[PDB]
Design a protein around this ligand. Structure first.
Ligand SMILES: CCCCCCCCCCCCCCCCCC(=O)OC[C@H](COP(=O)(O)OC[C@H](N)C(=O)O)OC(=O)CCCCCCCCCCCCCCCCC
Ligand SMILES: CC(C)CCC[C@@H](C)[C@H]1CC[C@H]2[C@@H]3CC=C4C[C@@H](O)CC[C@]4(C)[C@H]3CC[C@]12C
Ligand SMILES: [Zn+2]
Lengths: 53, 179, 165, 5, 53
């Protein structure tokens, strides 16, 4: 299917989704760079259930 | 055609102008980060315009309507798009730095342009500059240079957008009715 | 006029165009020309450029000849043709309604909607401006209800709408 | 059916 | 003939959709990892509370 105006709406929808996803990825990278992220915790500030370190 | 040739000529002129401005930025003082001098974007625009001039010579010379011609017309189009993006990014960076620099008072030191932003409490960001002849000379003409450069990349980005738009309009605006 | 209507007379349908009586056509052409003593080329051109009743078979013919190899980006809501080849007919008091030429002349009466409503005829493939103008016309008609004008019998519904090439 | 936005 | 997405363009569209879905899933996984590590919850960061003042 997807003959006419449906195609020209689906293309615009996909483009908008791609732009939103790119912005979201940029925000995630910004978060990962402001906080020095490691699998254990922020930079050297290790975080566990009991408390900080 | 004639219009793409004019667009390429304007692109090369603006690229050489912005590269000259960036070289002057670098030569004034090494007080500024590589991001604040967009001469790299100018070089990118320059190679864009070089490819454009070669394109518009070869199209008027020989091999006008073959498949590979379009195959790197698409390359020209995408390259101009990246040129436009880099020009707009340079505009944004220059605007941010000018906004930071336009609302603070500065004083002169023995060897640097040490000064601080207006602060509610006595701790704030401090900026120092290499080899300042006078804090009232570099700061006072730097804003003028920044404004001129802003206008330059704004016009360059508009030209790049028009160059991208023209060929696409050539392809996807007219549909043949008769046969 | 007589030589022209000879062709419909061969096929036994001249009565629709007013029959063999060519005099009313002369009366109309003189009424246009304010009873001018003579008729020139341009006056005749303007007279026939407004769908004269007896001459409709000249332009329509060419119009059909202009829409035998036209492909539209649409579908027929009745027979599920995709894409429509040939004419295209668009409704005005409805949304997303189109029908092919065969579905129109033959009368595939789908339950729910009748075919005694104003239509729009397209020969060449349409453009975006025509689509948005049709949308605006549908929206305007949606607030002009209560059957201002109705035509249930056929009686001859040839001049549907002009496309102006 | 030349496809584009 | 026929109109719409017919040949190689359909394959390209499906590939682009799959790639976008993969990127979205990767971004969601990254955000979930952040939430798990820093213990972000409805009550706040669960270890600090950045006040307005
Ligand atoms: C921007 C929005 C564009 C308008 C829009 O989507 O409607 C367009 C379509 C239907 O309307 P139409 O143009 O009369 O369709 C005639 C068509 N040629 C046909 O007869 O078939 O209707 C639709 O296509 C409506 C659904 C849109 C789906 C896309 C998501 C939203 C995108 C934003
Ligand atoms: C008569 C002459 C000028 C026609 C030349 C055709 C040119 C202008 C057309 C033909 C195919 C087009 C490309 C087809 C596909 C792509 C990839 C898409 O993601 C962005 C647009 C882009 C990059 C198009 C740019 C313009 C393009 C190269
Ligand atoms: Zn049909």
């Amino acid at each position: 299917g997807i003959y006419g105006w449906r195609k020209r709406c689906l293309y615009l929808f996909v483009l908008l989704l791609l732009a939103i996803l790119v912005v979201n990825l940029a925000l995630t990278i910004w978060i990962l760079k402001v906080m020095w992220f490691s699998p254990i915790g922020m930079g050297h500030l290790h975080v566990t259930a009991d408390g900080l370190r | 055609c004639r219009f793409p040739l004019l667009l390429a000529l304007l692109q090369l002129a603006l690229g050489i102008a912005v590269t000259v401005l960036g070289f002057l930025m670098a030569s004034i003082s090494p007080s500024l980060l590589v991001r604040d001098t967009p001469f790299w974007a100018g070089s990118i625009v320059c190679v864009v315009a070089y490819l454009g001039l070669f394109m518009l010579c070869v199209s008027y010379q020989v091999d006008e309507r073959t498949c590979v011609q379009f195959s790197m017309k698409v390359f020209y189009f995408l390259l101009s798009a990246l040129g436009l993006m880099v020009c707009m990014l340079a505009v944004a960076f220059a605007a941010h730095h000018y906004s930071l620099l336009a609302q603070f008072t500065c004083e002169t030191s023995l060897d640097s342009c040490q000064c601080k932003l207006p602060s509610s409490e006595p701790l704030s960001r401090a900026f120092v500059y290499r080899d300042v002849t006078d804090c009232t000379s570099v700061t006072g003409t730097f804003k003028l240079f920044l404004i001129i450069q802003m206008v330059l990349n704004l016009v360059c980005g508009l030209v790049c957008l028009l160059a991208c738009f023209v060929m696409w309009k050539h392809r996807y605006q007219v549909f043949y009715v008769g046969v | 006029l007589h030589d022209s209507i000879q062709i419909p007379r061969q096929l036994g349908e001249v009565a629709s165009f007013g029959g063999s009586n060519i005099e009313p056509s002369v009366r109309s052409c003189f009424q246009f020309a304010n009873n001018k003593p003579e008729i020139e080329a341009a006056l005749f051109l303007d007279w026939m450029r407004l769908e004269p009743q007896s001459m409709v078979w000249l332009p329509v013919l060419h119009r059909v000849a202009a829409a035998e190899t036209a492909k539209h980006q649409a579908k027929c809501n009745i027979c599920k043709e995709c894409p429509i080849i040939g004419f295209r007919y668009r409704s005005l008091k409805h949304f997303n309604y189109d029908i092919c030429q065969s579905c129109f002349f033959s009368g595939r009466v789908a339950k729910g909607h009748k075919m005694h409503y104003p239509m729009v005829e397209y020969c060449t493939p349409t453009t975006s401006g025509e689509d948005v103008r049709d949308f605006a016309k549908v929206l305007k008609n949606k607030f002009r209800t209560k059957r201002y004008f109705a035509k249930h019998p056929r009686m001859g519904y040839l001049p549907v709408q002009t496309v102006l090439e | 059916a030349l496809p584009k936005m | 003939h026929k109109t719409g997405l017919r040949g190689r363009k359909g394959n390209l569209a499906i590939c682009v959709i799959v790639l976008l879905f993969i990127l979205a899933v990767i971004n969601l996984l990254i955000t979930l990892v952040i939430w798990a590590v820093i213990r972000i919850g409805p009550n706040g960061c669960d270890s600090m509370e950045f006040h307005e003042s």
